Design a protein around this nucleic acid. Structure first.
Ligand SMILES: [Zn+2]
Ligand SMILES: [Zn+2]
Lengths: 82, 88, 109, 99, 95, 110, 93, 83, 99
DNA sequence: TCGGATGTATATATCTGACACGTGCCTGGAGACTAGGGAGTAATCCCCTTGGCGGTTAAAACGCGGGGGACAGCGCGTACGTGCGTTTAAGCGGTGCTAGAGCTGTCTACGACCAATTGAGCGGCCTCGGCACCGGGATTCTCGAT
DNA sequence: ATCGAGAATCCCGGTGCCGAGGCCGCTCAATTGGTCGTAGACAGCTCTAGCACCGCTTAAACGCACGTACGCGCTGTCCCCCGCGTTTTAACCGCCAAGGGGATTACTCCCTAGTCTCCAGGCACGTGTCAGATATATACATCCGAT
């Protein structure tokens, strides 16, 4: 059992992602909010993916079910099948 | 006006009120009995047959269906008798 | 044209037609499928594929590379206007992002 | 007299550095550990193949980059160059996922 | 045992690429992206045609179904070019 | 339930079952339709309709009216967020909007 | 003439079963008819896509179950699946 | 039967009323031009979709059902006009 | 002493009046004429069911109401109470209807 | 803080047309029986996914100096809400015409369905070069000094 | 304006390596042919709502004048991310292990498609009537210049 893993999204990783977005200056309060919104997005996507997988009586998830879950959220993705 | 244990008996299962929940119709029933009468039934109040399903969602999203004041009163007046039902 | 050959060749195409016809039928979109619909669909698919590969090849040549990579496809999709309008929402894996800096953000003396 | 750049110039250099690049940004192992966190939260004893978590990372970083584009636009709106909370909440509503 | 059959549009994308740029190669990842793009566009057009046919109580996916679906789905100039080239292809096939 | 009655009554539901089964069969969703699917779908529809009708009735009664109008449906859908999350993109004819003003827009207490 | 097929009477019956006093206007009846049709289309399309994904060819009950789980948000989905399974069991027995 | 610049038919008080339903107090003087522009662009998109549905059925009049179909195709599903 | 309200109070009053009410807000004849203009620009000699025009107008008011919510809060993001064009272009850009 | 001024909520008559209810039938729904194939279930196998070291080291945490930028306040001169008189064109009503939507019936060319068939295309292996990368040199923004 | 030092960047060359592409094997899906039941094209007929016009009322738009709220620019202040230098740690690459379940095949059965007959639930139709729109009269909440 492991817990308190939201901090795995480190400071410079968030800085680099926001920087790819063309952002220069980032206030110190941005990072916790980015962690929160990322957690919500993972919750939604994982919920859909595990629903798909549990349906097919498979106890391991696959990239096909992940991309299906993305598509169902109106977030279709290319590069892993479909 | 504090009712005795006889009025503290749940109207359906004839058992005491443990973690009471208060519907808008002031009707109260135990949480195991509440679950048995909502998830296994037609989502109706066990007493007046009222459907509080919208109220159910509204107060289960925040997990605030429990009426804390009544539970505190009962545990103040019947602590051990309520602890009797804790074992299974 | 009346010929005894593959339907793609008879239509002068390279995408499969019998396979596309099967996916129209066995894909459960209608109980009956017209004879000319799969040919039209194959033609449309070939046109779109040819256009997107042409743009990707131009981008790759501008990048001094003679091989198509997801970055080239991402650049080709984003830089075009109507292809963007068709595929603006979707995200491409390993595609990066357009080089774009806001004018206000540009340095000033 | 040590060399010292003015604040922002190297930030712009690496604006270009991470836009002309295509590699993944979030560190792989902590990210997949977080994914496992969420999975075991929703349903216990789940296993992941590598392609699944790679696709998850792809989608996650694409979403974050788009959100950061939007927050940069919001910050530019208020005549500011430092992104702030209220920019993020405004973007999150405006795209329609929170209301 | 023998492995199952996995359908893909690799050869056709390769053929059209050679027809457009005769000397340009393509990577496996780009090939998979192109395959997924073909699948997505096919699904979109076929689904739009399916709903359109169900809309007018029809029972057949005719060429007009696909033509109207393409007109609906692609932007202006792309739709016009696709309609023109598809009409050319279908009239050549039927002629 | 071995009753040889209509499937809606036999299953305890109130929406039709034969109609739903026909629509599933003739809607071109699969070549085969399971016997238990139509009743399950009718039950789901019954739940959603019952929820929205009771919310609209509560809204109308709170408005001192005895007939649900589209405004009442709009108010019931938007006031709740669960349904609003389910119905985010939809619009209702003569629906209107929730009466609200942003706190900054409110005048200063002078 | 031709016969028109709709859910008007069923919606009215459900409303009277819930609200034995309040009526409903024709426009609201059309709203609910279109609503029922829209949810029908959403769930049926999701179930068809899901069955195609697993290479099945028959919408069993669990197909609609998973479709409702995916489409409806969590708690509404919970109550929906609960009494849907209850109704299916009642129909069987 | 051609018509002239009826985009001015969407009069200033109409935008004012829509904005007031939009929860605003203060309206910029030149908001109206781009409000008309965005209204216009939304209109040719929806009208294109409805007209191509109508063309597909050998019909020369657009019906409300085609309009709601077109709105549904744009992620803007609408209730109260059938279907 | 002529009576004149302070600037704003009647604005809030009519905001509340229009929000609580659900009548149509655009005169039907000009909207019908404009729709006919767009139609004849697309194809000549089309006919309009009154219900179709009603559906067009309902969709239009829904669009404008949503866009005005969005642009109002975008404007108040910049410590302002007056919505100017740049609010509208930014709101449409970040919503993604113009790219 | 307060007393008119004004828009808003409230109570009552009224009258009307959309809403709720009776009808017939008919057309779609229910019941019985048959057939065949889709799906479940047993087995199994082998692909891969989790867990595990262990050395390295690139990147993350931490500290610190500071200078760009956020933010509060001042001031103004503009742009816009408010109100009133004017004009205008929408909205309602009523009527008249008919093009085209909708319905019916008929005939057939289109398309589903099944047996035979053979080559298009995919699985597995081999290979030669396109680009990754280290190493070096010229170029090129960037900052301080006047 | 200028010029010079210093990191950072573009350009050029050699090495290599794995993967993009080509070839062989071959299995099963597209092809062809013919047949038959029918969805659809088409001709015909009807009659509804769409179109077009008229005239009237007045609701609303429009324009102007005005007074005032505030959007924006400027200034000053401070404070706190940025860039850099130093230290640490877990990511990471490579290798190794076990088993477990995803995937595959083969068998059996029972569950739904199909057919036919029969029959009543719902709907197009016609009719009564009161829920709510509309007007008029009230009291009351709220605003604003002024105390
Ligand atoms: Zn109980
Ligand atoms: Zn009760």
């Amino acid at each position: 059992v492991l817990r308190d893993n939201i901090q795995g999204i480190t400071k410079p990783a968030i800085r680099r992602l926001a920087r790819r977005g063309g952002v220069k200056r980032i206030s110190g309060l941005i990072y916790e909010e980015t962690r929160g919104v990322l957690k919500v997005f993972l919750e939604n996507v994982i919920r859909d993916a595990v629903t798909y997988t549990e349906h097919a009586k498979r106890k391991t998830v696959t990239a096909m079910d992940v991309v299906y879950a993305l598509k169902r959220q109106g977030r279709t993705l290319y590069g892993f099948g479909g | 006006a504090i009712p005795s244990l006889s009025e503290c008996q749940c109207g359906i299962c004839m058992e005491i009120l443990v973690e009471p929940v208060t519907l808008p119709c002031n009707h109260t029933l135990c949480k195991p009995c509440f679950q048995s009468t909502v998830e296994k039934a037609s989502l109706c109040c066990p007493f007046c047959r009222r459907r509080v399903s919208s109220w159910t969602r509204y107060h289960t999203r925040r997990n605030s269906l429990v009426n804390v004041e009544l539970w505190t009163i009962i545990q103040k007046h019947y602590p051990r008798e309520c602890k009797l039902r804790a074992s299974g | 044209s009346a010929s005894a050959k593959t339907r793609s060749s008879r239509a002068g195409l390279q995408f499969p037609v019998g396979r596309v016809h099967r996916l129209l039928r066995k894909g459960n979109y209608s109980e009956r499928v017209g004879a000319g619909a799969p040919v039209y669909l194959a033609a449309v698919l070939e046109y779109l594929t040819a256009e997107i590969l042409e743009l990707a090849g131009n981008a790759a040549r501008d990048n001094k590379k003679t091989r198509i990579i997801p970055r080239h496809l991402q650049l080709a999709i984003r830089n075009d206007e109507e292809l963007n309008k068709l595929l603006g929402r979707v995200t491409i894996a390993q595609g990066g992002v357009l080089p774009n800096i806001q004018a206000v953000l540009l340095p000033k003396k | 007299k040590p060399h010292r750049y003015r604040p922002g110039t190297v930030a712009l250099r690496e604006i270009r550095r991470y836009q002309k690049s295509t590699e993944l940004l979030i560190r792989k192992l902590p990210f997949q550990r977080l994914v496992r966190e969420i999975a075991q939260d929703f349903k216990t004893d789940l296993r992941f193949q590598s392609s699944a978590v790679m696709a998850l990372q792809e989608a996650c970083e694409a979403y974050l980059v788009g959100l950061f584009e939007d927050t940069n636009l919001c910050a530019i709106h208020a005549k500011r160059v430092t992104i702030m909370p209220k920019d993020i909440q405004l973007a999150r509503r405006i795209r329609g996922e929170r209301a | 045992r023998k492995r199952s059959r996995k359908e893909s549009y690799s050869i056709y994308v390769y053929k059209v690429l050679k027809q457009v740029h005769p000397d340009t190669g393509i990577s496996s990842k780009a090939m998979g992206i192109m395959n997924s793009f073909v699948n997505d566009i096919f699904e979109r057009i076929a689904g739009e045609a399916s709903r359109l046919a169900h809309y007018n109580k029809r029972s057949t996916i005719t060429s007009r179904e696909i033509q109207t679906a393409v007109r609906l789905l692609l932007p202006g100039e792309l739709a016009k070019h696709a309609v023109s080239e598809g009409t050319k292809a279908v009239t050549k096939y039927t002629s």
